[PDB]
Amino acid sequence: KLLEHKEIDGRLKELREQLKELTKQYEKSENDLKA
Amino acid sequence: MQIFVKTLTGKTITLEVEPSDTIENVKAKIQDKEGIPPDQQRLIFAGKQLEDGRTLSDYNIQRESTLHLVLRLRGG
Amino acid sequence: MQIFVKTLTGKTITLEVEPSDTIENVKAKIQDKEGIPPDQQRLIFAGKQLEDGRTLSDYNIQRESTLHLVLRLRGG
Amino acid sequence: MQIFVKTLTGKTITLEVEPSDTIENVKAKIQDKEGIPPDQQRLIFAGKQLEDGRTLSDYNIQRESTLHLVLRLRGG
Amino acid sequence: TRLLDSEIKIMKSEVLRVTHELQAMKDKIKENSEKIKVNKTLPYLVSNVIELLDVDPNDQEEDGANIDLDSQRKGKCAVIKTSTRQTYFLPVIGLVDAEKLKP
């Protein structure tokens, strides 16, 4: 059965869902140092 | 216009595209919906690979045609 | 494996690495060998820049390939 | 047309050549007959330093001339 | 045809990257915020804003010698009056959002 294969596939969802969150913050953290 | 896109994962999705939209832009819109980076995407129509720069009209993709997604080697 | 990395000076270095190593480990080995800090040195292969985030296999670094090292050039 | 080469060790090497030969060729002949890499060899003939791209008759070297090899050591 | 699991052999590669990126960023924010903090020593001057200006890059460009600040700025800029009667132009506003300032 392919179910566990999609369970492993799940992790790419799990992580992209979090970096989509962080990337807006870390940009500002960089820029306010660059200034 | 509506097209079917069937992945080898087995999911099928309906996508609204124009006959003049490039295959690379279709990859961009899939990356919009699914997120999947386009470099991993190979789009096949009529068993033939679709060039990123070509359009539906160049491949003469008609109403409600189906594309197949292959997880290719990316470029990198 | 063995890998050759050469510099703008004309000196050349040979490293031992395994395909699962990341770029950062390369730079750390270079620092161990010579004392350059890991943040200064830039690497080049096949005419495109290296970046951390990847394993050495990922760029298809083969046996006995050649890398270029070039230093950070800052003044003020 | 015989030529004598003197290295740092004082070993003498005999060469059968032609006035229209080139320094690249004689440097290669030495590479074949002793094993020294060509590009490490620098040729010295009295004061002049010989350049690879041109021919012995341009320097009017004569029969049985004695000619010096110098090694440009490299950093390490 | 007989199926095969070849999909995972490509798919799985990204995990080793992203699991370390999500940790490295939330590591770096520590040092970055402290590096900002340790700059802010409280003996500030005090001063008044005189003007807010709209800025547009030049017509022509260069490399080998270009300035980040002459062209290659596009937002707001400010002109301030210090207490000790200096007047300074500022090319980069700094740690406050330009929206909330007024003369």
Side-chain angles (χ1 to χ4, degrees), chain D residues 43-74:
Chain D
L43 283 315
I44 302 298
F45 186 62
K48 287 278 285 199
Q49 185 187 28
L50 293 80
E51 294 185 317
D52 294 352
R54 56 165 62 263
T55 68
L56 287 303
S57 52
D58 307 316
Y59 298 164
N60 67 257
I61 290 168
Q62 295 300 336
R63 299 201 297 165
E64 205 88 327
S65 296
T66 304
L67 187 138
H68 277 266
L69 191 156
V70 165
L71 184 130
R72 171 60 70 87
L73 79 169
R74 189 62 68 166

Side-chain angles (χ1 to χ4, degrees), chain C residues 53-54 58, chain E residues 16-17 20:
Chain C
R54 291 179 282 95
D58 197 8
Chain E
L16 187 144
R17 307 195 183 153
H20 86 259

Side-chain angles (χ1 to χ4, degrees), chain C residues 10-73:
Chain C
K11 187 176 182 185
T12 63
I13 319 290
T14 67
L15 284 309
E16 205 294 325
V17 294
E18 291 297 309
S20 59
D21 291 342
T22 48
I23 295 310
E24 51 84 10
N25 181 239
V26 179
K27 289 184 186 180
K29 288 189 174 185
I30 296 304
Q31 174 174 229
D32 296 328
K33 190 55 58 76
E34 301 283 35
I36 317 301
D39 59 313
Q40 304 195 6
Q41 55 199 2
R42 280 97 181 85
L43 293 176
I44 290 172
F45 167 68
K48 62 179 177 179
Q49 306 192 26
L50 274 290
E51 306 173 42
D52 283 346
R54 291 179 282 95
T55 65
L56 199 57
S57 181
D58 197 8
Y59 266 23
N60 196 39
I61 289 301
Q62 187 55 274
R63 287 298 301 257
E64 319 321 302
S65 305
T66 186
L67 274 283
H68 293 189
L69 179 144
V70 64
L71 291 308
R72 175 189 184 192
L73 198 83

Side-chain angles (χ1 to χ4, degrees), chain A residues 20-32:
Chain A
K20 287 173 183 189
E21 203 91 318
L22 178 143
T23 44
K24 64 176 181 177
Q25 177 196 139
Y26 196 77
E27 164 72 340
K28 181 165 174 58
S29 194
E30 285 289 349
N31 196 33
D32 292 347

Side-chain angles (χ1 to χ4, degrees), chain B residues 18-65:
Chain B
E18 297 290 272
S20 62
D21 283 340
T22 54
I23 299 296
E24 52 85 15
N25 182 259
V26 177
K27 292 161 62 175
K29 290 170 174 184
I30 294 294
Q31 182 196 8
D32 173 26
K33 187 167 292 191
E34 185 47 42
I36 177 69
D39 48 275
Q40 293 279 38
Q41 306 173 27
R42 184 183 190 232
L43 294 171
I44 311 300
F45 166 71
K48 294 173 283 288
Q49 189 181 339
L50 309 179
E51 169 165 339
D52 55 2
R54 289 298 97 219
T55 69
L56 304 187
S57 60
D58 298 327
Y59 285 109
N60 312 270
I61 284 172
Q62 269 58 236
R63 321 298 298 165
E64 203 187 272
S65 291

